[PDB]
């Protein structure tokens with residue numbers, strides 16, 4: 001057993017707060033905000049050795065990242081940013097920093113009761129996205 005055991009599984013979005021304002025702060029344009037904001041993604045998290053994979057599937061886009069903790073990688077986000085990402089574990093929280101165009105956003109993923117809670121921060125703006133097991 002290991003590092004991210006409690007994250008592994010298939011998860012479905014059950015609530016979102018302040019996501020439009022997060023996306024605005026990130027620089028996402030109107031039509032992508034509207035369509036992406038409707039989506040109810042499924043997130044599939046798996047671990048194989050040191051490699052963590054996070055897959056997201058939705059009506060809008062499917063995304064997938066695979067990574068080693070602490071090791072920077074290139075990521076294409078769902079809104080089509082080309083970013084440089086580093087993901088670490090800090091006190092049981094997955095902390096994901098994305099850098100692009102001199103900007104930065106941080107996404108935290110944590111287990112809270114039977115939920116997986118995702119907090120997305122861009123400058124002073126936070127969005128909270130709650131997932132439950134599928």
Ligand SMILES: O=C(O)[C@H]1CCCC[C@H]1COc1cccc(C(F)(F)F)c1
Nearest residue numbers: 036039041056057058061062063078129
């Ligand atoms: O909810 C989350 O896990 C977060 C993760 C960080 C970025 C924001 C949000 C992902 O937001 C979206 C919104 C629409 C569709 C998709 C995807 F299925 F294409 F991945 C993803």
